[PDB]
């Protein structure tokens, strides 16, 4: 008997300028696992079985990695 | 008996300029796994079995990777 | 007995300029797996079995990868 | 009998300028695991089975990694 | 009989400038594990099974890693 929830109830000369803005937002992520079986055997690699939530307004940079999940970088410069 | 939920109830001279804006937003991601079986055997690679939520307003950069999930980079420069 | 849900109920001289805008938005992603079996054997590659949600307003960059899921880059420059 | 929840109830010459802004925000992440079995055998790699929540306004930097989960970097410069 | 919750109830010539702003915020992360079994055998790698919450306004730096979870860095310069 399992559950995961995210709720938002609202039982209810102005001048907005650049306001009430959402920029790079993650909201309401619900996840359940029940009676799951997992066998990982990893060798030199990347395994991701979980929950990842990345919220970013700005990522500047030449050759930047802004959000990586399960990433194997093996470059030769 | 499994469940995952995300809800939003609203039982209810202005001047908006660039306002009430959503930019790079992830909202309401529900996921369930029950009685699942997984066998991963990974060697030098990338395996992603989970939940990923990436919300980004801006990613500037020559040769940038803004959002990578299960990525194997092995370049030769 | 499995379920995943995302709901939005609304039991209810203005001047909008560039307002109430959605730009790069992911909303309402529901996923279920029950009694699934998976055998992955990965060697030097990328396998993605999960849920990915990428929301991006802007990604500038010569040779940029904005959103990659299950990507094998092995260039020779 | 398991549950995880995140709620927000509101039973209810102005001038906003650049205000009430959300920038790089993670909100409402609910996760449950019940009667799950996991066997990880990792050798020189990265395995991520948990919950990750990254919220970043700005990440500047040439060759920067802003948010990495399950990342194997083995470059040769 | 297990539960984890995060709630926020509000049973209720101004001039905002750059105010009521959220920048790099993590809010409301609920997680439960019941009757889970885990066997990790890690050798020279990184395994992350727990809960990580990173909230950062700014991370400047050429070659900076702003938020890493399960990261194996073995570069050769």
């Amino acid at each position: 008997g399992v559950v995961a929830a995210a709720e938002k109830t609202k039982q209810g000369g102005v001048l907005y300028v650049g306001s009430k803005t959402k920029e790079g937002v993650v909201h309401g992520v619900a996840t359940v696992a029940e009676k799951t079986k997992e066998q990982v055997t990893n060798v030199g690699g990347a395994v991701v079985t979980g929950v990842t939530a990345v919220a970013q307004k700005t990522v500047e940079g030449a050759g930047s990695i802004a959000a990586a999940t399960g990433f194997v970088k093996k470059d030769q410069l």
Side-chain angles (χ1 to χ4, degrees), chain A residues 18 21-26 54-60 66:
Chain A
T21 311
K22 286 196 181 189
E23 300 187 352
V25 173
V26 176
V54 179
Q56 304 176 132
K57 168 173 165 182
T58 294
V59 179
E60 302 194 12

Side-chain angles (χ1 to χ4, degrees), chain A residues 30-56:
Chain A
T31 302
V32 183
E34 176 160 8
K35 295 175 171 180
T36 64
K37 299 185 185 186
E38 294 179 13
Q39 300 184 3
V40 179
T41 169
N42 173 230
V43 181
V47 186
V48 181
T49 69
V51 176
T52 306
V54 179
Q56 304 176 132

